[PDB]
């Protein structure tokens, strides 16, 4: 349950940062990893919760 709950936090935390990255594209503030890369990390973290 530790890694499972941690996996959910990493997923939720990643989704929170993912939405912030999308706001930068609308307001044009700096650059970095695209939104597709951030969403992919949340997907891997989401599946990690099911495994744990």
Residues that bind another protein (CB under 8 A): 2-3, 6, 10, 13, 17
**Alpha-carbon gap, residue 13 to 34, rounded angstroms:** 16
Nearer to another protein, 17 or 47 (CB): 17
CB of 50 to another protein, least distance (A): 16
Nearer to another protein, 1 or 28 (CB): 1
CB 14 within 8 A of CB 41: yes
CB of 27 to another protein, least distance (A): 20
Helix-, strand-, coil-residue percentages of the chain, each rounded to 5: 85, 0, 15
């Amino acid at each position: 349950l530790n890694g499972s709950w941690v996996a959910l936090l990493q997923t939720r935390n990643t989704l929170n940062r993912a939405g912030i990255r999308y706001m930068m594209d609308q307001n044009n503030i700096g650059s970095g990893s695209t939104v597709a890369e951030l969403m992919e990390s949340a997907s891997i973290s989401l599946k990690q919760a099911e495994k744990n």
